[PDB]
Amino acid sequence: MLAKDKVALLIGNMNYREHPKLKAPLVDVYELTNLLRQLDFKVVSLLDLTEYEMRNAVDEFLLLLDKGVYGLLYYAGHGYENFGNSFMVPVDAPNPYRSENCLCVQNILKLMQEKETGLNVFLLDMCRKRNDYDDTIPILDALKVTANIVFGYATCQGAEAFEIQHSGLANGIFMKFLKDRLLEDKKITVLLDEVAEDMGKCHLTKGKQALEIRSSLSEKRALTDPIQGTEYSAESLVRNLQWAKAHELPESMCLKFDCGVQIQLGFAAEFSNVMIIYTSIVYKPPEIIMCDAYVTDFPLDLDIDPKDANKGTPEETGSYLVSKDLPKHCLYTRLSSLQKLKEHLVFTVCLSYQYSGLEDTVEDKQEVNVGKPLIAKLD
């Protein structure tokens, strides 16, 4: 079995403004993103999206999809279910909230089917209880009989999905078990079934949470199926190239200051909407005794806290996922909410120095523009 393309959208929502906050979607999404990439999926991973952002991300995902393409959606965050319809709850939902504030998974399925995907996979790592404030009784249109649909729900209808309250890293229950199986060369339905068995052995979740699989898939399609890669339309290749650009951060640039010092500006991706910037004092003409380099003046859209920027360790920025994957001895800054970027990312590298003999500090600073960062390119 071969797939014309494999494409995944992964969303983790943790920091709700009007509802309890979550911790593990960041690990779940990060680790799943990596496993999917090992299977050659073109993946977009996004943290903490609003309703508007979630819809836009879905619109981008849909653009990738084409006849024969395997599409996968993974969601870790708050959700609800009314009348067998699954809804994803964005971080900007009010309390209480209604369906119009959320995204209905089935509608996404309908749109995917309109693209003639070869496989539709939904992994919904969220609660499935009712939202009683939402009183609407939607007449969702009947889906076409694709025979390509697989739902892996972290929990059963009417029940809850969980993560572990452990300080430091810990997956949610679903990912805890999924990640050990995900790379298996098996029909995705069978794989999920093994996953359901693994979860059943969890004492902590017994009687509270169990995987539910819903499938109408009539062919031996596996996540490990090879990409055919022969029939791309030119428009697709450009879309693929654009996706690759979103996937790739700007390469590091060496900044030359008028006073002759050089600073290394380095970039790392945590998610498609989360970048880490690091700076280091690579070079000094001797005449200058002391050097200080630091970053600032970010776009407001990013809502970056200067208290939380220019840190000794990546860990200090709220970047726990990437470390020791980053050059040591560098200031670190975490740019999250990259999707909120109206204008090319522009910021300021500032430098403070004293010359040997001279005793007064000098202040020089230059605007760097990497322009669009990651996901932002997509539009």
Binding site: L22, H78, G79, E160, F162, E163, Q165
Partner: peptide
């Protein structure tokens, strides 16, 4: 245990 955390609820989602």
């Amino acid at each position: 245990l955390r609820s989602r």
